[PDB]
Symmetry: C4
């Protein structure tokens, strides 16, 4: 009674404070305005029409001509607003354009992959899909300024980006845009005249950044426009907000204090876990609750490391921007900001589920946790079998529909599409348009096996295992009644 | 036999009459035309295009320029219709514009939140997000009439409104529009010329009201246009119909009689409940059916109170409107009308579920109610655990997606989005566009745990508890067969 | 062995032939082209734009002006096609316009419902919602021709139609359009000039018909445009195809022979059922399979009656059309054609489920039918309770959302919306826009009770009852093993 | 121990290698770019607007006039791109138009089906729906060139296509388009002038092909435009990519080696299966795992046969194209390419499920496979009953909605629509617009029976059968405990 209950109360109170501190960190990271901030930026660049007298937008850029219309018209009419009655430009009035934008481009060599000898009469040229081996180093067109000559990824301060069809590395050819509107449009017109953008060009980035004074919040923009070798064009985007500068109001000091307290909490857990390793040399790794604790500790250490080694020291970049009007390179920081934010979120998710360990001081909740534990083995056993059939079905679907329907375009997405089908969300009209024989057969059979038969085995396994724990508890009550 | 069955018959008949009276009140409150009435009003103002030669509408106002186009063109061309061949204006011919509209505006001070010293070269101004502390009291632009000078919430007859991004209180700056069309457009043009609407402006209300003679039904309009500090614009609306005047036809007298009868019914319940409190001093609060009765009684008292203290005496406002052509302020009444309508609905919902108490005079229905009662404890025990995992998942989702996807924009909505995911309704394409690594992982894992494992524990708990009551009833039949 | 098996074989073979004949009738009624026939007609009139230089269509007619644009432009440019190089008009070339269209209108009296005395200064007129009592009999505008004078429902050959907001009876004011295009447009222009269509007008029908020579198929059109008293406009439509003339090819003779055979089959069933009534005077109505048989017999008699008393003798109408160029009134026949088609379908549905009676000559299928029979009582017992909670929830939803969201506009639809919610199809964004406090609460609670708790009681009832039949069969095998 | 485990290890390792080889074949067949290739082609022809100054596209061609606008404008402006500064045309620059397109047409005779004698005054012509009997052989209009004279399916090198409303066989009338743009437009204008396309015309194909040099990938196009006799127009499409030429890079040699290895694997299986037939003469066909093996063997033989007899020898066609500028007829090869791809996919699906046979060397997975085996009989027994009710419901729905809603247009699709309804995806608004009485009743009843009652019997059958295997294993443990 003395050692158990006191040690549980010691552990619980400290864990609850650790949770509260963790929830204060999450509340500080995410301000509730932020959504609307990014939404307005997206509306400006993505959703708006390209020119005044047509339907098309950024989201559905089809041609190279279309992309050229976007860069000349609506890209600029987003970035450069006529000054309110120096000549520094704002967005929406409230947001500040930092320095200038940048148009970057990669390109692939002439004859980078060999053509079959059957069609050597007609075709005298070829360019294959992006890879670091096949990327062009040589000059291009007019030999004039930085815009046309290649520059390596260590020469620039740029990193690799994970694009849609393929990963695009570092940099090659790039123009820095002007701070004024009329000079920019002249530079873009000169690029269009001399055909800077052509067949062989693969990845094109339009990058820049903004800062909102009102809520103290930087934000970067990365308009990637992939050109697949196939022919047409694929777009994407990224709007990452970013609390770059920290210390301003009383709320920030309070957030800073919590982060320091979190550090001491993590330190205490690390001591407590590894003290227990000294006691139990090889008996410690098998218990579930301890394993979960170690994972929370490791994530927290990684979060701290990302915060200290990288995210803190970056103020050097911002100080360089303060003294000039050139391009400011945030892009490398944002990449770590997202990664930090990811890891913190997963930490929170695991921290909340750990709370279970101190729930079972009531009878009913205790029996349910014992049911869940005993069923785990059977469910895991079934889960393998379920996945085998699931992944075969996905492979079938990929082989049939891969060409036609967006849903199953890559194998990565095919799984997730099938998961949506189980719930109740599917683009059936498109499947049926792709293949009228097998398409609906795949769909019927999948529903018939997965939804009526196999998903109910999970249930049957749980069901019976619950009944067996209730009978076990009834016999414990009846056998105790017989003994007394 | 005598005391039980007679007292049940006494209670049942009186309860059934109380239910019928309650259903007559609900039928009287809601006329089946009402939907189409509000639909036509919404179509006029929300859905229509802003100007003649463009795509945009009210629902997707992006810029301040856009809002200005709406107020000058389609707002007025909704309100003011060319008289059919005094000069009083109608809507659709059948509806009557009451008096005039009102354009209200709030605004925040210059330099209400401090700027960081790193960017003190470029930025010389700032305005933070709405709060009562930071709201501007001082004058503005031309010092001319009521439109530009501040007025407090007790000086005006206006209340606080619960807006989208933040709660907007009382009033500040406001113009009353003209009764004719051509004077209004001149006043709106003069506002646009002198920049009455600028950076720093937060909440803007366009209010007015209409009355339909044909079905005797007033209706208010509240076009709120929020300006978040971020930069752009967010719209909303509210179309509340309102049976203001009552006594006209034989149907209204019948409705009035029912409301009076309902009053005596409630009075009788109150006596019956509190007479039972005198009998059972501390044994009464634990039984479910009695607790439900007390809650129905409290709601009914609150409904009566809202009807008498406020909703009835408001005819003073309507009488003031009858003698003039100025702005009529319905807005304060409507707020209570909705609250009444809410509470009445919840009363009805609880009243219907109370009917259960007099269902169990058949064997099968009795066993099911006994199953539901015994399972309640286990289900409640599980419900806590289910919610812990659910709310952790929501917290994870909020941390990942909060910036990108509309669905999880606020924590309040994040829960409800997850509930939709379980059923079969989700915007998957948007999640995947926000975060390709973790986004679909969150979705898979959530489906895997919640939909295949955890939701089936509810079922398993019910299932086994039903089987145990059936075995208990079989042994009661078999043990009675052995005794006889 | 002799009496049972022979009598089962006698019954089965005759029933299978009756089923095959019934499936031949259904195959004959529905030709697989028919869908595309109606689809093209709908595209022409509903989906197309009103004028050349605007967005709006028939489906979203908002104003009276809009309706006037439709009748003058796209209505006529659908009906009248420039003759291919008599002057008889076609649709798509392949379809034939029969005679002419008709524009019918109803109207309500001046001051049909009394106005409150508070607003007697401004409002000097009123018109209430459609009813037969309040419908106007008197003349109107210019006293000229049939178009402006009222005519009763027995004077015309027209019936009542079940409209959307209210049932519209017979007729009142109507113009028959011309056979040529240029005369029609002059008549429509003259109506628009003198304001034939005004405030007080309620229901407006644009009726006509077409005949396709190519597949031998008539089709009627009923463009109803309701004007609710509220102010705006509501549209609907109806495109009923119709095999009017029968005897042409060998397929029709074969269909006719099957219908005659079906008649003798029904006759034989009637004798067989009522012979069994003579045997078992009051022991016959309780068994399920016999009850189902009687219902199939009654429906078949009703189907035959509708076929003979009405649908056959109508050729008189078609013969009158053959001799002239006036309006042909199909409308009364179509009403019975749909009713016949409904009843036949329900007959087929019941006939197929009757097949169960001759399935149970295998052991496994027999046990399942015995499980389904024993569970019926409990499920029925639960079904009542389930519906009580369901209908309370619907009543709550109706009281909250009735004004705002289309989904719950009428109580009839509210039920069906809730059924969709359970499956996985809901317009959540609209509910949340209607009421942010209670709206999502209604949705959460409904999902929590209905989807996690109550729908699984059905399952639990079945589950346990199946297990009890399996134990009963195991003891029958074990007790038979002990006896032998 | 020696014979079992060694023979299992022999079988397992060889099967795993066979699986890996099979997965290498699938990875080789489907390149991850392919989706985007077909997507860009579809965007060009389907989604784009017809003319510059209107809304309509290919997907929603309504009229013959509309089709004529497509062929004259956007068809050509897709195919023919202005040469970059011989005169050979490209698509997107990166893709190559092969030779030329082809416009093919079928037509039906005058008076092919007899008209009723009641309407012999007005109608003097008729054309019925496509069939080989009724197809026109005779000449047409100007007797000039190949475009107007009929040619049979054995005279041409063309096959039958499975269209939407009806199967269209071989060929009749066809024009080969020019290699240049300006000659094509003159030929299309001459067709439009002399009314080559008229009433009576049924199927129209616009065929051509492209080749991408960059990724070595041919692709065919088949723009079918069906004219139903009803009146209007129905479109469809088909974009089949095709790896025609093989041997180029090291990856292809590796793929070729794997295909040869697969051949020897299949050969070994065939010997192993039929060696076992020699041993067990009539005891072999009843076991499940052997039956599955035979089916995988048969599919593989069919896949090999399709690869050798047809898909390999087709290079003759490509060699004929290399020497000329005429039409190249790929169409016959593509048909087999899809069929091969189908069969391979189904082979993969079955191969993956075969893996189960070597899973059961752990206790938990073994019990689940024994549960699944014993339940199979009951589930199969229930499945029949379930389908009877399901197919009756479908028949009911078809009879009601067949005319109105797209969903249930054909009986083939009606089944699949009902399957979607169970999951949570349904167009409810359309059903309700088709029939307000019975429409929602069908939907309620279907949900009530199928979703709450019948789908849970599957579950109940599994549930109890799992519990019975767990009790059987518990008694095997307890009886073994008693014996020891
Ligand atoms: C591209 O490569 C081909 C084949 O090697 C060659 O004939 C041609 O001259 C090259 N063109 C350019 C512009 O480099
Ligand atoms: C090269 O760049 C200069 C400016 O540095 C510009 O004036 C000139 O037009 C460019 N050369 C050519 C050939 O266009
Ligand atoms: C706004 O505040 C800043 C900083 O205090 C000040 O320099 C400026 O004069 C103010 N402007 C106005 C218009 O009040
Ligand atoms: C002030 O208001 C008056 C009308 O009361 C108006 O005539 C005048 O234009 C306004 N003053 C200025 C400076 O615009
Ligand atoms: C309509 O009724 C009102 C009230 O009875 C009356 O004053 C008016 O003259 C009537 N007008 C017409 C056109 O009948
Ligand atoms: C009455 O109808 C006649 C044709 O019958 C027409 O000429 C005349 O215009 C109509 N009367 C008036 C006043 O318009
Ligand atoms: C079509 O057939 C009808 C009926 O046999 C005949 O009168 C007519 O001359 C035919 N027309 C043509 C163009 O063949
Ligand atoms: C027949 O075809 C020739 C070309 O071969 C063309 O010149 C002529 O216009 C055509 N005949 C008629 C009558 O159009």
């Amino acid at each position: 009674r003395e050692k158990y209950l006191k040690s549980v109360l010691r552990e619980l109170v400290t864990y609850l404070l650790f949770l509260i501190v963790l929830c204060i960190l999450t509340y500080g990271m995410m301000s509730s305005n932020v959504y609307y901030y990014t939404r307005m930026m997206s509306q400006l660049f993505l959703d708006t029409p390209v020119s005044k007298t047509e339907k098309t937008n950024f989201k559905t850029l089809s041609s190279m001509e279309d992309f050229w219309k976007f860069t000349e018209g609506s890209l600029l009419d987003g970035l450069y607003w006529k000054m309110q009655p120096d000549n520094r430009s704002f967005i929406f009035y409230e947001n500040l354009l930092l320095g200038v934008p940048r148009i970057r481009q990669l390109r692939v060599r002439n004859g980078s992959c060999s053509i079959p000898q059957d069609l050597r009469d007609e075709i005298k040229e070829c360019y294959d899909v992006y890879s670091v081996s096949s990327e062009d180093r040589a000059p291009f067109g007019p030999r004039n300024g930085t815009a046309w000559i290649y520059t390596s990824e260590k020469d620039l301060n740029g990193s690799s980006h994970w694009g849609i069809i393929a990963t695009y590395s570092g940099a090659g050819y790039y123009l820095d845009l002007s701070r004024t509107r009329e000079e920019t449009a002249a530079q873009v017109a000169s690029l269009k005249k001399n055909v800077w953008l052509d067949r062989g060009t693969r990845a094109t980035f339009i990058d820049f950044s903004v800062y909102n004074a009102n809520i103290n919040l930087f934000c970067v923009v990365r308009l990637l426009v992939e050109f697949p070798a196939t022919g047409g064009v694929i777009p994407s985007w990224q709007f990452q907000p970013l609390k770059l500068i920290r210390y301003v109001t009383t709320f920030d000091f309070f957030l800073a204090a919590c982060e320091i307290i979190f550090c001491f909490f993590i330190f205490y857990y690390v001591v407590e876990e590894i003290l227990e390793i000294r006691i139990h040399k090889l008996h410690y790794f098998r218990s579930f609750w301890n394993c979960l604790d170690v994972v929370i500790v490791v994530l927290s250490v990684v979060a701290i490391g990302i915060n200290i080694y990288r995210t803190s020291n970056v103020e050097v970049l911002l100080q360089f921007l303060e003294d000039q009007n050139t391009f400011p390179n945030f892009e490398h920081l944002a990449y770590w900001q997202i990664q930090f934010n990811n890891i913190a979120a997963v930490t929170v998710f695991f921290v909340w589920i750990k709370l279970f360990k101190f729930i079972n001081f009531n009878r009913t909740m205790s029996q349910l946790s014992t049911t869940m534990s005993r069923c785990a083995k059977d469910l895991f056993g079934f889960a393998i079998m379920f996945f085998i059939i699931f992944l075969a079905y996905a492979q079938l679907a990929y082989l049939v529909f891969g060409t036609q329907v967006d849903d199953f375009s890559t194998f990565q997405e095919c799984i997730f599409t099938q998961f949506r089908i189980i719930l109740g969300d599917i683009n059936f009209a498109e499947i049926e348009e792709a293949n009228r024989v097998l398409g609906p057969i795949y769909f019927t059979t999948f529903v018939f096996f997965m939804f009526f038969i196999l998903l109910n085995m999970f249930l049957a396994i749980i069901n019976d295992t619950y009944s067996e724990v209730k009978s076990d508890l009834a016999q414990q009550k009846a056998e105790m009644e017989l003994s007394d």
